[PDB]
Ligand binder design. Structure first.
Ligand SMILES: C=CC[C@@H](C(=O)OC(C)(C)C)[C@@H]1N=C(c2ccc(Cl)cc2)c2cc(OC)ccc2-n2c(C)nnc21
Ligand SMILES: C[C@H](O)COC[C@H](C)O
Ligand SMILES: [Cl-]
Length: 111
């Protein structure tokens, strides 16, 4: 079935977040955190609800989101996990802030 008009706008935002023009700051958010691979053995004790853009994309393809609010809560959860785990001066936090600016300004243009 066809996404609602608001969910079409959300899918457009998601495609933009995954696109080459934002890759320089978006790439850490592309796939789930692999805590063992990165050596962050406390990650799952601190972050109880992991989220990333590939998971948001699978949920949109599977029609899991029933409205725009549910989609936005997942994208914001992904940024909040980054702000919770890392110190505020970390390089990856600066990248999160820049991608979140892209997201919030386009989300605000919702039909
Ligand atoms: C989860 C690990 C904490 C954080 C970190 O210190 O990672 C390292 C690898 C130990 C430096 C890590 N930094 C990064 C990170 C650190 C510096 C720069 Cl310039 C870019 C991303 C990170 C890297 C990844 O590579 C596949 C995946 C997820 C990353 N991420 C996210 C999302 N949130 N925090 C991070
Ligand atoms: C940088 C804050 O964590 C998120 O700011 C969003 C604003 C639209 O730039
Ligand atoms: Cl929210």
């Amino acid at each position: 079935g066809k996404l609602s008009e608001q969910l079409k706008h959300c899918n457009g935002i998601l495609k933009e977040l995954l696109s080459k023009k934002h890759a320089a700051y978006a790439w850490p958010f592309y796939k789930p955190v692999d805590a063992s691979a990165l050596g962050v053995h406390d990650y799952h004790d601190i972050i109880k609800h992991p989220m990333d853009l590939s998971t948001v994309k699978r949920k949109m393809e599977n029609r899991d989101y029933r409205d725009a609010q549910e989609f936005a809560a997942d994208v914001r959860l992904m940024f909040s996990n980054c702000y919770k785990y890392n110190p505020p001066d970390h390089d990856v936090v600066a990248m999160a802030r820049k991608l979140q600016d892209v997201f919030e300004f386009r989300y605000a243009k919702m039909p």
